[PDB]
Design a protein around this ligand. Structure first.
Ligand SMILES: CC(=O)NCCc1c[nH]c2ccc(F)cc12
Length: 168
């Protein structure tokens, strides 16, 4: 069984724990929790083969810069998650891209863009904006709803395939 070390980055107000709990115990936790560092490991069957996904969640708030430049080690797969109600989280993606470009030493890397809380009526970020931005980085934009659990599985399959194809 192969272990995929993936990291989930996001801004304040997104709730990375909402994605983990929804896949772990299939439950949407509305209660916001300041997850500083949480590693969730579960056996997920992708494409028909059972693999282990090691999802590392880190503080989405800016404070521990010392740890931010230290935890970045086993970052095989990157997962950029943002909410369509906050424009800052969407514009912050560029800043992260420039950072990942350095702490990786590679022009190409398996990355995917997922839009959470798309079922929410608070649509402040247009979908075309995400598509246009995604095309610039050269990554696929996948809509994902963790509240009603839709577009979640496909978002994993796609990313896993990207890593698999990249390595092979
Ligand atoms: C740093 C350490 O001791 N453990 C983390 C292990 C890990 C799992 N998934 C990841 C994704 C990115 C990353 F940088 C690390 C991880």
């Amino acid at each position: 069984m192969t272990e995929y070390k993936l990291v989930v980055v996001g801004a304040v107000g997104v709730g990375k724990s909402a994605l983990t709990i929804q896949l772990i115990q299939n439950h949407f936790v509305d209660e916001y929790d300041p997850t500083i560092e949480d590693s969730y490991r579960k056996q997920v069957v992708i494409d028909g083969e059972t693999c282990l996904l090691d999802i590392l969640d880190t503080a989405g708030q800016e404070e521990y810069s010392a740890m931010r430049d230290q935890y970045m080690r086993t970052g095989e797969g990157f997962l950029c998650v943002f909410a369509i109600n906050n424009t800052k989280s969407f514009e912050d993606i560029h800043h992260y891209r420039e950072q990942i470009k350095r702490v990786k030493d590679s022009e190409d890397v398996p990355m995917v863009l997922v839009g959470n809380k798309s079922d929410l009526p608070s649509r402040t970020v247009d979908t075309k904006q995400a598509q246009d931005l995604a095309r610039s980085y050269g990554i696929p934009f996948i809509e994902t709803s963790a509240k009603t659990r839709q577009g979640v599985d496909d978002a994993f399959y796609t990313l896993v395939r990207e890593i698999r194809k990249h390595k092979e």
